[PDB]
Scaffold this active site. Structure first.
Site, PDB file in Angstrom:
ATOM      1  N   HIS A  41     -82.446 -52.246   8.075  1.00 49.99           N
ATOM      2  CA  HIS A  41     -83.749 -52.363   7.424  1.00 49.99           C
ATOM      3  C   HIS A  41     -84.081 -51.139   6.618  1.00 49.99           C
ATOM      4  O   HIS A  41     -84.944 -51.192   5.728  1.00 49.99           O
ATOM      5  CB  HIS A  41     -84.831 -52.526   8.547  1.00 49.99           C
ATOM      6  CG  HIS A  41     -86.233 -52.651   8.033  1.00 49.99           C
ATOM      7  ND1 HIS A  41     -86.766 -53.883   7.698  1.00 49.99           N
ATOM      8  CD2 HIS A  41     -87.229 -51.752   7.847  1.00 49.99           C
ATOM      9  CE1 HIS A  41     -88.014 -53.729   7.280  1.00 49.99           C
ATOM     10  NE2 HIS A  41     -88.317 -52.447   7.357  1.00 49.99           N
ATOM     11  N   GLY A 143     -93.073 -47.867  12.956  1.00 50.69           N
ATOM     12  CA  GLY A 143     -92.255 -46.670  12.975  1.00 50.69           C
ATOM     13  C   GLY A 143     -91.342 -46.550  14.177  1.00 50.69           C
ATOM     14  O   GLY A 143     -90.548 -45.598  14.246  1.00 50.69           O
ATOM     15  N   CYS A 145     -88.937 -48.707  15.082  1.00 53.84           N
ATOM     16  CA  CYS A 145     -87.623 -49.306  15.047  1.00 53.84           C
ATOM     17  C   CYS A 145     -86.539 -48.247  14.932  1.00 53.84           C
ATOM     18  O   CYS A 145     -86.767 -47.139  14.411  1.00 53.84           O
ATOM     19  CB  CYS A 145     -87.537 -50.334  13.937  1.00 53.84           C
ATOM     20  SG  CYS A 145     -87.905 -49.659  12.305  1.00 53.84           S
TER      21      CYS A 145
END
Ligand SMILES: *CC(=O)c1cccc(NP(=O)(Oc2ccccc2)Oc2ccccc2)c1
Ligand SMILES: *CC(=O)c1cccc(NP(=O)(Oc2ccccc2)Oc2ccccc2)c1
Lengths: 306, 306
Positions: A41, A143, A145
């Site tokens: 991501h 925040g 991940c």
């Protein structure tokens, strides 16, 4: 005495946590030897929600588009590749704090500690379980991940979970450390929902044994059950089927307490059918299913309070 | 989203844990700078239960009767003294892993993380609260004394608890790091029992606010209460009195959720009077009182799920 939801000491993992930035996207990474692992991501942009093509997104990046910050030191990226839904960034420095480690893909019903982190800085540690529907009931904010889940065994850290996303029910989904999701989830903004979940029967039974080890027998009865008849009741209460393998696994706790597994199953059947009637077990008013048989053996005395 | 009983990352404390042996007695110690702190119980013998005189026991010891093991390194003791119920052993080496630290004596209702340790080796980390009766509901086995409790704030470890003993109800008693017991307890084998305990009202209210922040409002009502009338109900249910100071402390959570403190008090009054009727809050079927208002603010989003 006592029984708490206990996590592994997190120091060996703390020394591995870094921050990774690509463009305007920042998240956590895991630095082991000279590789940093993070959710792919990180290469997404503000517009890439609906259907990002990660191969296309990544070929457009160079090593220097990735910024890795380890404390107050910038690490230079010297290679990159993507493996399933994780990115691997080769850096020019091996982490001197790398523990002995392994990557493991866990089964549903297994537990692990999560070190929640933000901007590469650890904030908290807690215990959770891989649910039967392959979500976890974590505690994660924006925040988080790239935060990881792990077990520790004789100083070897087995990493089993990297956090990616939060589903609409507030539960959490993520990958093993080779980037394969647990469950059917995908890293794209599409309607995805947790599937119906079930209670982890073998873990409830382990925790009833913990209650006995700690000195409490109130919920026991004089009955037994066959495995088949127990599973008929279990199926009725949205509990997972109990297998003979689970019975085998509960052997040592059975032997420590002198309570045959199928006798504890008769206890649990009565608890399901009748409720607790205002009583508690190990300070809970619900049947707890996030302790494995191994967790109970690790935390409890080897001597039962008879 | 999510809400878990979260501990602080334990690495900064792990690097401080050592083993201390005197004669045949071994327990855990805390190595900061060139001092090791441990329960004075380490100088007790197998017979010294009933009424040990620690001054008399200690004058009979020399520096070399104390063995301090830090990993696989023996630390040489070069001085010793006793301060209340702790021993301070001056060693010839300063711990290179000493974090920034403080010693704090906490108030009842405050929470902290415990790093459970055996033979100087950390085994697990969990969160607990100083109960109003100055016991803690820990998880401790034989060999765990000298394990410590702590909070971490901006990389400064505030140590607040050293574990000494288990009372007959299975709850735990110990000291601050200057060796003063919490509560009336003494380190001798005499009939000692936990006093009647109460529920920490301000923490229950904080956790109801956490439930709202996380998106759940089922237990709310249209009522309010005066502080006086609430405290009449609280006293009836073995809850601690709520002070105006507690109301002030809950200010920020009140402002984040738009629920006046005394309106949440009316919620709690209804929950006490009526029970939960089979519903849960944040996955619990009991009212949880081991999260402070600070703990909720730390773990929860700063943005309410409206
Ligand atoms: C932080 C991180 O690593 C991460 C990994 C996967 C997904 C997300 N956020 P999300 O909103 O989906 C994407 C948005 C943009 C680009 C790619 C993925 O997660 C999500 C949640 C619920 C349903 C569907 C998707 C962050
Ligand atoms: C391990 C440790 O540090 C420790 C500290 C205080 C007390 C104990 N054990 P306990 O049985 O009391 C003593 C026994 C012998 C010598 C001194 C103290 O604790 C205890 C528990 C319940 C009631 C009374 C005493 C260990």
């Amino acid at each position: 005495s006592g029984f708490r939801k206990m996590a592994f000491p997190s120091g060996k993992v703390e020394g591995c946590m870094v921050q990774v930035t690509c463009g305007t996207t920042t998240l956590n990474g895991l630095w082991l030897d000279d590789v940093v692992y993070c959710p792919r991501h990180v290469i997404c942009t503000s517009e890439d929600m609906l259907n990002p093509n990660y191969e296309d997104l990544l070929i457009r990046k160079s090593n220097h588009n990735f910024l890795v910050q380890a404390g107050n030191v910038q690490l230079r990226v010297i290679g990159h590749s993507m493996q399933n839904c994780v990115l691997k960034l080769k850096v020019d420095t091996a982490n001197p704090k790398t523990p002995k480690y392994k990557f493991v893909r866990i089964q549903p019903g297994q537990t692990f500690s999560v070190l929640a982190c933000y901007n590469g800085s650890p904030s908290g540690v807690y215990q959770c379980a891989m649910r039967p529907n392959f979500t976890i009931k974590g505690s994660f904010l924006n925040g988080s991940c790239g935060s990881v889940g792990f077990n520790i065994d004789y100083d070897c850290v087995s990493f089993c979970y990297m956090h990616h996303m939060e589903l609409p029910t507030g539960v959490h989904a993520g990958t093993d450390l080779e980037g394969n999701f647990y469950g059917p989830f995908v890293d794209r903004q599409t309607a995805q929902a947790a599937g119906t979940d079930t209670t982890i029967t073998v873990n409830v039974l382990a925790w009833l044994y913990a209650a006995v080890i700690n000195g409490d027998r109130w919920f026991l009865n004089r009955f037994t059950t066959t495995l088949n008849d127990f599973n008929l009741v279990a199926m009725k209460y949205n509990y997972e089927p109990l297998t003979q393998d689970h019975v085998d696994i509960l052997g040592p706790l059975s032997a420590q307490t002198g309570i045959a597994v199928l006798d504890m199953c008769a206890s649990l059947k009565e608890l399901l059918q009748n409720g607790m009637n205002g009583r508690t077990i190990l300070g809970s008013a619900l049947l707890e299913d996030e302790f494995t048989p191994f967790d109970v053996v690790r935390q409890c005395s080897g001597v039962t309070f008879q």
